[PDB]
Amino acid sequence: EVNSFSGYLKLTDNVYIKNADIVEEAKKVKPTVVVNAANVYLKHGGGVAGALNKATNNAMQVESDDYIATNGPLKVGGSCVLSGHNLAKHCLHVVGPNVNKGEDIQLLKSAYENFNQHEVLLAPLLSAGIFGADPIHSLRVCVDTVRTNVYLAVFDKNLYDKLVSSFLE
Ligand SMILES: CC(C)[C@H](Nc1ncnc2[nH]c(-c3ccn(C)c(=O)c3)cc12)c1ccc2c(c1)S(=O)(=O)CCC2
């Protein structure tokens, strides 16, 4: 079965959310597109990007290095489409702003806009965690910006509960 998302809570007609690890979701669901929370040089050194690369046994990093050699780095708020490997048909590498490194939070709208070129996506909460954005603000930007169908996997039950409570106010 295609895009077999299970156990999500529907927030709006096009945004769903689950307390789950995106890597485990990508193995179970086999989505058409999995979003990576990338950096501009596609160096998958930790967090979500490191976990998705490790699940591909480093095939994602080798492919990413070859892409950067030919095309140069991405811009903050930009994206590229590369192979999904064993995790998805395609990986959409999206660069949200890293507020902890001084990048502009306004670029988070441009980052989510990349999602609208794909009908269905499995994605993480952009710019949250160590990128420093307020995760409740990142969910609000996602809901207001994404028009295609997006399944958000957030690997922390405490944050999940705060995000669902905030949306339902
Ligand atoms: C907010 C947080 C709960 C969320 N975390 C995650 N959300 C969804 N699936 C996840 N898998 C893992 C994971 C991490 C270690 N290892 C070993 C794994 O195997 C699997 C993390 C994780 C998240 C959302 C966005 C971003 C980050 C973190 S960040 O800090 O990586 C910087 C980039 C933006």
Swiss-Prot record:
Activity regulation remarks: Inhibited in vitro by GRL-0617.
Subcellular location: Host endoplasmic reticulum membrane
Taxonomic superkingdom: Viruses
Reaction it catalyzes: Thiol-dependent hydrolysis of ester, thioester, amide, peptide and isopeptide bonds formed by the C-terminal Gly of ubiquitin (a 76-residue protein attached to proteins as an intracellular targeting signal)
Membrane-topology annotation of the record: Multi-pass membrane protein
Domain called Macro: residue spans: 2-169
Subunit: May form homohexamers. Interacts with N protein.
Function: Responsible for the cleavages located at the N-terminus of the replicase polyprotein. Participates together with nsp4 in the assembly of virally-induced cytoplasmic double-membrane vesicles necessary for viral replication. Antagonizes innate immune induction of type I interferon by blocking the phosphorylation, dimerization and subsequent nuclear translocation of host IRF3. Also prevents host NF-kappa-B signaling. In addition, PL-PRO possesses a deubiquitinating/deISGylating activity and processes both 'Lys-48'- and 'Lys-63'-linked polyubiquitin chains from cellular substrates.
Protein name: Papain-like protease nsp3
Organism: Severe acute respiratory syndrome coronavirus 2
Protein encoded by which gene: rep
Residues included from the entire protein: 1024 to 1192 of 7096
